[PDB]
Design a protein around this ligand. Structure first.
Ligand SMILES: N[C@@H](CCC(=O)N[C@@H](CS)C(=O)NCC(=O)O)C(=O)O
Lengths: 6, 189, 6
């Protein structure tokens, strides 16, 4: 799992 | 929504098995006196999760040629264990409530759109689901100010680019390869 | 509830 900033 | 649907799902057994857990049976009936075998969990990275069709709360009716509609818990386990490397399941589920598809226009602030995403192929946010999910909205950022986007929203598309079954890195690239005004297609529960 | 790993 990943989490990215937009 | 709420109505029964029936589905054939064939799974290939991996090293860790089929990649799901079951409850139920004639001797362990969960929910009233319903003896059905139910899926209680989809194992992250397992065969059922990669396949993506099996869902928590699905009832297994048949395993290959074996009728598991009214069997003991142990009989179901045995039938699944003995089913070979290619397992043909016939399942039943109640259709989930429909999602609202929504279009959202956001103007970037100095720190972008002001939300975080998770999910993608190989980084499933929910086991069995390859979708891109909103996991965080930045207080005071563009998404917050607009007020429409929420945690748990699924991002379906950015401008003209679909985000169906894409890798996480491609989802990020698509969301960053944008001008200052961005159009999002979103699925709300 | 009884739960088995498959
Ligand atoms: N549509 C076919 C197949 C549906 C199916 O595979 N599900 C049930 C029949 S209601 C079944 O017995 N499956 C066991 C199997 O895979 O042979 C039929 O009319 O039976």
């Amino acid at each position: 799992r990943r989490e990215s900033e937009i | 929504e709420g109505e029964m649907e029936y589905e054939e799902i064939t799974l290939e057994r991996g090293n860790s098995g089929l990649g799901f857990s079951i409850a139920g049976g004639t001797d362990n009936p969960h929910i009233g006196d319903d003896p059905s075998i139910f899926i209680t969990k989809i194992i992250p990275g397992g065969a059922a999760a990669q396949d993506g069709r099996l869902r928590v709360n699905d009832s297994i009716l048949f395993v290959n040629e074996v009728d598991v509609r009214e069997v003991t818990h142990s009989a179901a386990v045995e039938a699944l264990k003995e089913a070979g490397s290619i397992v043909r399941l016939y399942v039943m589920r109640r259709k989930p409530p429909a999602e609202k598809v929504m279009e959202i226009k956001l103007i970037k602030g100095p720190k972008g759109l002001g939300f975080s995403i998770a999910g993608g192929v190989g980084n499933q946010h929910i086991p069995g689901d390859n979708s891109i999910y909103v996991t965080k909205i930045i207080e005071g950022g563009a998404a917050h100010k607009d007020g429409r986007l929420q945690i748990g929203d699924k991002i379906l598309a950015v401008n003209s680019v679909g985000l169906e079954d894409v890798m996480h890195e491609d989802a990020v690239a698509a969301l960053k390869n944008t001008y200052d005004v961005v159009y999002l297609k979103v699925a709300k529960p």
